[PDB]
């Protein structure tokens, strides 16, 4: 029981490690889409007044 879990929690650390791998890239590609969509409001906010 304690032996197979010692190799079942090993692969669970890899599998919940690779779901952290994609998700930080899902954090990044949404953040750079966030600032840019937050940035172009300012340009659309500034070009109308100049």
């Amino acid at each position: 029981e304690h032996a197979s879990r010692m190799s079942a929690m090993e692969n669970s650390t890899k599998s919940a490690g690779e779901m952290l791998g994609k998700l930080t890239l899902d954090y990044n590609r949404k953040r750079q889409a966030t600032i840019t969509t937050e940035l172009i409001e300012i340009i659309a906010g500034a070009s109308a007044l100049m």
């Binding site: 659309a44 906010g45 109308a48």
Partner: protein, 71 residues
Amino acid sequence: MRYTIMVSATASDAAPLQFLAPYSGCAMAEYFRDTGKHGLIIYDDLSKQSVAYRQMSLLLRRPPGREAFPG
């Protein structure tokens, strides 16, 4: 339909007819409130009325804000 009024601004109509249709929709139902009765109102697709507000201002040289919606 006997006890139902329906103001129906389509998407193939202009913006301000959609912009006014919840406003005219509550103009009917204030009469039912004023003369003692009870009134039901459903402002269906109220986000799409706000997009109907966003169309008019951004042609009207008005400053945009959050998600290019006006102030």
